[PDB]
């Protein structure tokens, strides 16, 4: 015991897949996992958008807990989701609409 000790600083953009997401995955569909993350995300969304909580002591929105968590998590989750929801497309050559 000295002072936390241990540290790390990856070059990649705050990591991405790696063995982490490698084991994280599984097989289950996104319909479920997604839906859930939708209720959570959306929830957190409507929350931030709306003015609820009843605290009156946070006119910064940065040094929080559930907010910061929703920010980070939300970022990850969302990011992933988006990538998926969008990836849903065939795979490439998205030339929709006719001019």
Swiss-Prot record:
Keywords: Membrane, Transmembrane, Transmembrane helix. Residues 48-61 are extracellular. GO terms for cellular component: membrane; mitochondrion. PANTHER family: HIG1 DOMAIN FAMILY MEMBER 1B, HYPOXIA-INDUCBILE GENE 1 HIG1 -RELATED. This is HIG1 domain family member 1B. One of its GO terms (biological process) is mitochondrial respirasome assembly. It is found in: Membrane. PROSITE patterns: HIG1. Residues 1-29, 85-99 are cytoplasmic. The keyword Transmembrane helix applies. Residues 1-94 form the HIG1 domain. The chain crosses the membrane at residues 30-47, 62-84. InterPro entries: Hypoxia_induced_domain (IPR007667), RCF1 (IPR050355). The keyword Transit peptide does not apply. It is a multi-pass membrane protein.
């Amino acid at each position: 015991m000295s002072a936390n000790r241990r540290w790390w600083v990856p070059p990649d953009d705050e990591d991405c897949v790696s063995e982490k997401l490698l084991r994280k995955t599984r097989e289950s569909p996104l319909v479920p996992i997604g839906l859930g993350g939708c209720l959570v995300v959306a929830a957190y969304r409507i929350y931030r958008l709306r003015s609820r909580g009843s605290t009156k002591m946070s006119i910064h929105l940065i040094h929080t807990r559930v907010a910061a968590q929703a920010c980070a998590v939300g970022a990850i989750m969302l990011g992933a989701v988006y990538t998926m929801y969008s990836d849903y497309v065939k795979r490439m050559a998205q030339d929709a609409g006719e001019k």
